[PDB]
Swiss-Prot record:
Entry protein name: CD44 antigen
Tissue distribution: Expressed in the intestinal epithelium.
Disulfide bridge positions per record: C9-C111, C34-C100, C58-C78
Organism: Mus musculus (Mouse)
Post-translational modification: N-glycosylated. O-glycosylated; contains chondroitin sulfate glycans which can be more or less sulfated.
Compartment list: Cell membrane; Cell projection, Microvillus; Secreted
């Protein structure tokens, strides 16, 4: 197995994770993924603070309770011109990206490279953290605890 995890800069500890392809994480896998990063699925208030510090993406992703996109600037193809933490209301489907929250991060923007999946456990997968600047960190292990996700 090989799994690539593209991670963004953290904003008030909140970051975005894309696994392999766009929108391929379930809600259970997302919770396990954040846990592997010693993080949690963000609360809405945590996400709102991150947005205020400059966090935005053009990707739907899990937080605690909902699927959201943080938007600073209005774009027609990113939450249909909405700004703020846009909550996904209507979808047939169950697989998105995820957000995670790391309490130990700096309070503002942190674009240093993520170098580990610290809480990952023993397993057969090559897990590679890919940062936006291309710097990579790989380890062998596993983070999924539901067979359905494997
Ligand atoms: C029913 C019903 O109809 N439903 C209603 C519902 O409608 C739905 O809305 C959805 C929505 O969320 O809007 C729609 O979903 C989208 O559909 C689109 C088409 O179908 C999809 O394309 C889109 O996917 C997203 O596309 C994006 C894209 O831009 O192509 C992707 O984002 C890009 O990702 C890239 C890779 O990561 C990024 O690099 C890029 O960011 C840009 O990067 C630039 C760069 O580096 O080149 C950068 O440019 C630099 O900028 C700096 C300044 O900061 C300069 O200094 C520098 O010079 C620049 N460099 C250059 C250019 O030289 C830019 O800053 C930066 O933007 C990403 N682009 C963007 C836009 O950020 C993204 O990854 C794809 O996911 C779909 N979107 C989503 C969210 O999935 C759907 O179609 C509809 O069904 C409504 O939402 C709802 C409203 O209530 O109502 C329902 O009824």
């Amino acid at each position: 197995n090989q799994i690539d995890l593209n991670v963004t800069c953290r904003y008030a500890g909140v970051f975005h994770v894309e696994k392999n392809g766009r929108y391929s994480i379930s809600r259970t896998e997302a919770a396990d993924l954040c846990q592997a990063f010693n993080s949690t699925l963000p609360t809405m208030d945590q996400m709102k603070l991150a947005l205020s510090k400059g966090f935005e993406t053009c990707r739907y992703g899990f937080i605690e309770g909902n699927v959201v996109i943080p938007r600073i600037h209005p774009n027609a193809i990113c939450a249909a011109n909405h700004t703020g933490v846009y909550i996904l209301v209507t979808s047939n489907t169950s697989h998105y990206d995820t957000y995670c929250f790391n309490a130990s991060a700096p309070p503002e923007e942190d674009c240093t490279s993520v170098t580990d999946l610290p809480n990952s456990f023993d397993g057969p997968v090559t897990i590679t953290i890919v940062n936006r600047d291309g710097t990579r960190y790989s380890k062998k292990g596993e983070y999924r605890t539901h067979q359905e996700d494997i």
